[PDB]
Amino acid sequence: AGLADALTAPLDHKDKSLQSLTLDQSVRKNEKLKLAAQGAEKTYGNGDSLNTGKLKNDKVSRFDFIRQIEVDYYTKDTNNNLTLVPQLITLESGEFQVYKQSHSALTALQTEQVQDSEHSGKMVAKRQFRIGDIAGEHTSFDKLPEGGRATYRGTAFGSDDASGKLTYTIDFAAKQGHGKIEHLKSPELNVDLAASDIKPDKKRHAVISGSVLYNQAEKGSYSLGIFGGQAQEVAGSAEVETANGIRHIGLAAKQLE
Ligand SMILES: [Cl-]
Ligand SMILES: [Cl-]
């Protein structure tokens, strides 16, 4: 059971492929994100690293997550002394999903329950699926291969559905990429990832931002990042319109051998 190992054991260099993943978007400052699986539990803050090295590659590892913030209320004790009573306000709760590759990884949050209108401690059930962090060894835009084509194959996973097949292709001469998502339960999500050019972002990493097409029809967008010194992997997300509103999908692919 490498989930509890990911929750209790420290980092290791002889672990396979991607060792660590910094949790920045999954937890904000002053928040506590508690993950539990296989009878183990660990609390995470803002800079904290998740030991993805113990997780299996190319699969979606699942934890139970609860997101809390701590408040110290002011009370008067037996005497007239000030006593602070710490109370943990549960902000969110659900399933925490992690997809691990060799040079990249991403987390997704399946919110099952949140606080209520005007709060007051009551939890209401409201589902949401969003992407957390997308981290790894970003490929430099200025160190991309000068030519050749590359076929990345991988997984597209959304709410209650992790069987999506992602297929992306990058021509490094034209510096362009395009792909498709297949075999998802929801038919409106099996979309084409339209051709768009490779761009450098603010830190000059290699990223691709294109349109999501459903029967040659624009119904959202997708963002991918290139990871690995030799552009081994891609990882990102997609926002797709459906009859049930907008859905979010996690994307992660790698070249094969
Ligand atoms: Cl008094
Ligand atoms: Cl949703």
Considering the domain architecture, whether residues 62 and 176 belong to the same structural domain is answered as: no
Residue 130's domain comprises 1-139
Contacts 24+ apart (CB under 8 A), 242-245: 242/186, 242/188, 242/189, 243/188
Q: How far is Cα 207 from Cα 212, in angstroms, rounded to an integer?
A: 16
Q: What residues pack around ion ligand 2 (CB closer than 5 A)?
A: 129
Tell how far the Cα of 87 is from the centroid of ligand 1, in angstroms.
Answer: 24
Tell how far the Cα of 72 is from the centroid of ligand 2, in angstroms.
Answer: 33
Q: How far is Cα 232 from Cα 40, in angstroms, rounded to an integer?
A: 33
Cβ neighbors of 63 (< 8 A, separation 6 or more) are 3, 7, 35, 36, 37, 95, 96, 97, 98
Considering the domain architecture, whether residues 132 and 225 belong to the same structural domain is answered as: no
- Ligand closest to Cα of 80 equals 1
Question: What's the DSSP call for residue 48?
Answer: P
Tell how far the Cα of 223 is from the centroid of ligand 2, in angstroms.
Answer: 18
Task: Identify the CATH number of the domain in which residue 81 sits.
Answer: 2.60.40.1980
- Ligand closest to Cα of 82 equals 1
User: How many domains is the chain built from?
Assistant: 2
Cα R_g (the chain), whole angstroms: 21
Tell how far the Cα of 99 is from the centroid of ligand 2, in angstroms.
Answer: 18
- Ligand closest to Cα of 131 equals 2
Considering the domain architecture, whether residues 101 and 198 belong to the same structural domain is answered as: no
Tell how far the Cα of 89 is from the centroid of ligand 1, in angstroms.
Answer: 29
Q: Which residue type does 178 have?
A: H
Tell how far the Cα of 127 is from the centroid of ligand 2, in angstroms.
Answer: 6
